[PDB]
Amino acid sequence: DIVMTQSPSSLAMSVGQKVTMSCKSSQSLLNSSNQKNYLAWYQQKPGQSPKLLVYFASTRESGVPDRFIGSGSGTDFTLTISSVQAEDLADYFCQQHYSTPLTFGAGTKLELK
Amino acid sequence: DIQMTQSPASLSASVGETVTITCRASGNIHNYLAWYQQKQGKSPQLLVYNAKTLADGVPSRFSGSGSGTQYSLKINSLQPEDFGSYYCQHFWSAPYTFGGGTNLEIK
Amino acid sequence: VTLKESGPGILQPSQTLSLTCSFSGFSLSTFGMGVGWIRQPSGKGLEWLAHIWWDDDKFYNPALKSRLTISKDTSKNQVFLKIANVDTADTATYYCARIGEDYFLDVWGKGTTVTVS
Amino acid sequence: QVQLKQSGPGLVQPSQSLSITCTVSGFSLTSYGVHWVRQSPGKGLEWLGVIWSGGSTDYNAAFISRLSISKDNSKSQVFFKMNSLQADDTAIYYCARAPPYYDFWSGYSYYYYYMDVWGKGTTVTV
Amino acid sequence: NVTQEDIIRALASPLIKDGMVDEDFAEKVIENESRYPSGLQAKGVGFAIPHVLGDYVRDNAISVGILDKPVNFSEWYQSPDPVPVRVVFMLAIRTWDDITNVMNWIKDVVLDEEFMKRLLNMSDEEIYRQIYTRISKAPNLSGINFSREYVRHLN
Ligand SMILES: *[C@@H]1O[C@H](CO)[C@@H](O)[C@H](O)[C@H]1NC(C)=O
Numbered sequence: 001d002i003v004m005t006q007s008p009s010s011l012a013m014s015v016g017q018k019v020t021m022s023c024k025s026s027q028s029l030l031n032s033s034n035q036k037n038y039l040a041w042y043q044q045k046p047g048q049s050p051k052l053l054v055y056f057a058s059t060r061e062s063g064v065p066d067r068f069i070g071s072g073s074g075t076d077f078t079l080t081i082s083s084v085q086a087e088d089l090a091d092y093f094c095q096q097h098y099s100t101p102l103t104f105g106a107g108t109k110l111e112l113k
Numbered sequence: 114d115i116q117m118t119q120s121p122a123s124l125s126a127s128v129g130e131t132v133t134i135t136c137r138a139s140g141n142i143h144n145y146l147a148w149y150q151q152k153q154g155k156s157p158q159l160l161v162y163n164a165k166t167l168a169d170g171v172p173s174r175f176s177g178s179g180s181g182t183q184y185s186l187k188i189n190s191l192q193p194e195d196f197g198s199y200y201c202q203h204f205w206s207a208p209y210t211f212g213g214g215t216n217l218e219i220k
Numbered sequence: 221v222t223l224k225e226s227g228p229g230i231l232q233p234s235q236t237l238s239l240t241c242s243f244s245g246f247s248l249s250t251f252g253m254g255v256g257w258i259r260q261p262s263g264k265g266l267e268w269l270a271h272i273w274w275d276d277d278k279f280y281n282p283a284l285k286s287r288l289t290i291s292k293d294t295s296k297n298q299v300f301l302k303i304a305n306v307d308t309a310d311t312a313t314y315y316c317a318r319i320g321e322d323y324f325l326d327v328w329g330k331g332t333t334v335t336v337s
Numbered sequence: 338q339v340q341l342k343q344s345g346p347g348l349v350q351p352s353q354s355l356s357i358t359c360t361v362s363g364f365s366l367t368s369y370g371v372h373w374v375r376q377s378p379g380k381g382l383e384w385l386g387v388i389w390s391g392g393s394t395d396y397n398a399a400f401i402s403r404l405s406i407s408k409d410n411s412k413s414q415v416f417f418k419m420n421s422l423q424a425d426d427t428a429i430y431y432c433a434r435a436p437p438y439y440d441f442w443s444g445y446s447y448y449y450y451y452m453d454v455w456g457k458g459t460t461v462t463v
Numbered sequence: 464n465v466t467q468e469d470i471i472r473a474l475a476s477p478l479i480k481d482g483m484v485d486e487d488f489a490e491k492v493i494e495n496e497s498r499y500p501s502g503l504q505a506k507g508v509g510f511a512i513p514h515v516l517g518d519y520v521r522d523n524a525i526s527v528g529i530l531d532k533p534v535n536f537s538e539w540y541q542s543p544d545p546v547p548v549r550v551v552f553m554l555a556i557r558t559w560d561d562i563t564n565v566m567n568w569i570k571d572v573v574l575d576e577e578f579m580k581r582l583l584n585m586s587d588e589e590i591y592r593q594i595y596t597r598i599s600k601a602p603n604l605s606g607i608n609f610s611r612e613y614v615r616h617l618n
């Protein structure tokens with residue numbers, strides 16, 4: 001299999017500032033240019049949305065405007081859209097693309113307090 | 114169309130002179146023109162393989178150049194037995210239309 | 221290597237013309253070489269009539285108004301250059317020539333003489 | 338207007354097999370893909386083997402050490418159904434759509450292996 | 464003055480003439496061109512694969528158009544950027560297995576620039592000979608039609 005790991009276990013959030021998270025794996029880069037990854041947004045109840053990010057670009061659907069795209073190298077990462085209101089959802093789960101097993105990683109979640 | 118033309122229609126030179134013959138296409142050749150020489154009363158003998166390449170061991174005196182729609186055959190110095198009729202053909206559209214041809218005379 | 225030709229001498233305008241090629245060591249079992257025919261009216265330049273590639277296909281000079289129909293055999297590499305109607309302008313030497321690889325007319329024959337009366 | 342609806346049994350003990358049917362409406366089964374993923378509260382999410390639903394083409398088995406026997410992934414023109422004989426774990430239930438086109442520079446397969454629109458899911462217990 | 468319009472039809476013409484496709488093949492190809500990034504330029508010399516993967520096909524064929532003056536097509540991966548294409552490979556393929564087999568052959572055609580180079584300065588006969596030879600030597604793609612009428616150095 002291919003190792004997948006996240007750096008944070010959870011992050012505190014408040015309305016203001018930006019929320020930073022990162023994702024590592026054995027390798028997501030392609031030789032014929034490009035890079036394949038995707039970070040998923042999960043509402044606590046339906047958990048239905050990897051659709052907000054395709055590769056390293058805003059998704060085909062409306063998604064969320066001004067979504068930030070992070071590093072294009074071996075280690076991927078993302079920031080929330082500066083200060084966000086959202087709610088305490090598992091806004092990101094990092095998944096492998098370009099791999100037959102398509103292993104999934106753990107989520108991060110936001111925490112208000 | 115693909116009509117080929119050639120000039121001068123008739124030219125003459127003494128032995129030892131340099132001779133240039135111009136062959137032109139209405140279309141685009143992409144370096145597929147080849148020249149050959151006809152002796153009076155005999156079939157032509159292949160002279161070059163392409164505008165830039167020697168064919169079948171003929172004398173190095175025969176060479177040529179060109180691009181696009183403008184090609185020419187050049188002889189650095191005429192020797193005995195090189196006089197006669199010169200023709201050019203292109204490997205582009207299947208109807209490999211001939212140029213008008215030139216008669217290089219002894220004078 | 222060696223190419224010879226055969227055909228009629230004096231024809232009437234209403235007759236069909238038939239001209240053939242004869243080769244020795246030339247083989248038509250490979251894509252590399254085709255065969256074609258060149259016409260030369262006396263005192264004029266050369267005119268391309270038609271050719272057949274190793275892949276059995278057929279190309280004609282459109283200036284001949286589709287009067288030329290050509291079949292090609294494998295026995296004796298016969299190419300017939302059949303012309304349905306021979307006019308009084310068609311007074312020329314007819315040559316058979318190899319196309320060769322690329323566009324190298326390496327093998328030419330001696331040519332036949334076609335006239336009218 | 339375009340939905341994936343899932344239905345199947347819960348409270349399934351090891352003596353009974355698990356069979357879940359995902360009815361697809363608005364995402365034709367001759368164009369779009371359908372993927373399945375397991376989501377337990379205690380391990381993270383995991384990929385299940387899928388058949389591309391744009392035509393029953395080239396079943397890609399996943400996790401051979403985790404592969405069940407006689408996993409058919411049957412595809413009809415109306416619905417897709419998954420089955421597993423053991424039913425020895427929980428939360429095997431998400432159905433999702435995959436992009437209907439080719440991954441031209443892929444290094445192993447020409448499908449994208451990407452999930453787009455997820456269904457509602459089911460509740461699976463032992 | 465070269466654009467995308469009538470390139471698809473220009474390359475479809477020998478297929479409808481031969482009868483390898485059903486009626487207006489070119490329009491169905493254009494519909495896929497409208498919805499998808501068929502370009503896949505991926506190189507300084509733009510490459511394209513306009514195609515249809517449905518029915519409306521009587522048998523499988525490859526039709527290769529050559530364009531001396533580029534016409535941009537939408538790029539893959541990130542569709543908003545158009546990229547100019549010089550060589551267009553139209554594919555009429557059924558049963559799916561042949562679309563993968565054809566793309567793998569095409570990948571073995573675009574890669575190794577020595578073949579990709581000089582493609583714009585070869586006659587219809589030389590292009591036919593080279594493509595025919597590379598198809599016949601492939602381990603697969605047997606049965607797919609290719610002929611002189613399917614090669615257009617211009618248009
Ligand atoms: C093709 O792309 C180039 C580079 O962006 C651009 O300058 C050109 O206008 C494009 N072609 C057309 C027809 O717009």
